[PDB]
């Protein structure tokens, strides 16, 4: 189907505790494949997926040099944004940036992304046209004016339409046995009595990849959105994910409830009920 590549940058100041830390991780879909950490004894871009290990020294050296440059640029940037908000030297702050590309089943660019946050709130984002900016406040307008003057948008668009799509295509082919393989969820329904009046039906999904999934409870065929407790999708540690959906039902009405599971690893969506 469709695929994404994303890089996630986190730069965090820590006054009195040395210079700001810079961390970068790269993903294809829900698979991490590289990391860089400026706190490492010897910082380098390092492999985190087997199919990236075959890349040559020029690849690793280029990704490492850029990340080391980014460490300094993000330290300077944290200083700049502290000034923009008239903030004290004593506080710790965070710049976050996520950028990347989505491509379709034919590898054609669907859209590009470049968004930045400051202390967890939207700061500046490249617009979907890959040509204009959305600044959250007058501080980000200062960044916007710097970036217009350096023609950053052209350089980000060039990357997003160029290297991003071409390297995503290369990774998808080199890692095709995992990245282009959808593992369906293993499902079951558990029954946990609450009292003599009520019980919890919990619908389980295990071992699935990618993370995207929809689990819903119906009572007499009507979605129980308001009454369903959804747990956040969680990683198993082996590339796969887990999730469950729960609903509190009247004792003796269990067969009126059905769990519905949609996932791209499944030929057809699933309807499940409690099997006592």
């Amino acid at each position: 189907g469709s695929h994404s590549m994303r890089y996630f940058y986190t730069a965090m100041s820590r006054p009195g505790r040395g210079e700001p830390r810079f961390i970068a991780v790269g993903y294809v879909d829900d698979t991490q494949f590289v990391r860089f950490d400026s706190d490492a004894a010897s910082p380098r871009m390092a492999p985190r997926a087997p199919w990236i290990e075959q890349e040559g020294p020029e690849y690793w050296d280029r990704n490492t040099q850029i990340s080391k440059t980014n460490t300094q640029t993000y330290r300077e940037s944290l200083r700049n944004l502290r000034g923009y908000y008239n903030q004290s030297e004593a506080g710790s702050h965070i710049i976050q940036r996520m950028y990347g590309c989505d491509v379709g089943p034919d590898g054609r660019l669907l859209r590009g992304y470049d968004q930045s946050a400051y202390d967890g709130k939207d700061y500046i984002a490249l617009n979907e046209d890959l040509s204009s900016w959305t600044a959250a406040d007058t501080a980000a307008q200062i960044t916007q004016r710097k970036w217009e003057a350096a023609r950053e948008a052209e350089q980000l668009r060039a990357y997003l339409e160029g290297l991003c799509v071409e390297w995503l295509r290369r990774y998808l082919e080199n890692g095709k046995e995992t990245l282009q393989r959808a593992d369906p969820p293993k499902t079951h329904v558990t029954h946990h009595p609450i009292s003599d009046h009520e019980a919890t039906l919990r619908c389980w999904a295990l071992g699935f990849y990618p993370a995207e999934i929809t689990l819903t409870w119906q009572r007499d065929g009507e979605d129980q959105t308001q009454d369903t407790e959804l747990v956040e999708t969680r990683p198993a540690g082996d590339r796969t994910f887990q999730k469950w959906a729960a609903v509190v039902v009247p004792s003796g009405e269990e067969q009126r409830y059905t769990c519905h599971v949609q996932h791209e690893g499944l030929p057809k969506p699933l309807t499940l009920r409690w099997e006592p």
């Binding site: 890089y7 990704n63 850029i66 700049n80 710097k146 290297l163």
Partner: peptide
């Protein structure tokens, strides 16, 4: 592969 290092904020 990462994007070339860009301008400071």
């Amino acid at each position: 592969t990462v994007r070339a290092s860009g301008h400071s904020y």
